[PDB]
Amino acid sequence: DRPIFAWVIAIIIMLAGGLAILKLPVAQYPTIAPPAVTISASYPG
Amino acid sequence: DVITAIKAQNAQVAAGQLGGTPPVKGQQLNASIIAQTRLTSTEEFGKILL
């Protein structure tokens, strides 16, 4: 097993994750909420 | 005359409230007003004035 090939594989894994970190700005959560669809009407007085 | 008498007497109307929403400073109470209510039974329907 020679080095120069592997030390390029690391660059692929470097650049692929380096482009995936460009999901900036990344949100705190992860959607937990069971979907909420709301209907609203207003009958004044 | 029958139909017209129904929606005139069997109706759910909406009136405002005491102490409204833009009130007079010093208003102590705020309560809703109920006027005409929707009829419930067969006897109440037998008493519509034509």
Curated annotation (Swiss-Prot), chain B:
It comes from the Bacteria. Disruption phenotype: Loss of susceptibility to contact-dependent growth inhibition (CDI); inhibiting cells still contact the target. It is found in: Cell inner membrane. Induction: Positively regulated by MarA, Rob and SoxS transcriptional regulators (at protein level). AcrA-AcrB-AcrZ-TolC is a drug efflux protein complex with broad substrate specificity that uses the proton motive force to export substrates. Belongs to the resistance-nodulation-cell division (RND) (TC 2.A.6) family. Homotrimer, with large domains that extend into the periplasm, interacts with AcrA and TolC. AcrA may be required to stably link this protein and TolC. Interacts with AcrZ. Part of the AcrA-AcrB-AcrZ-TolC efflux pump. This is Multidrug efflux pump subunit AcrB. It comes from Escherichia coli (strain K12).
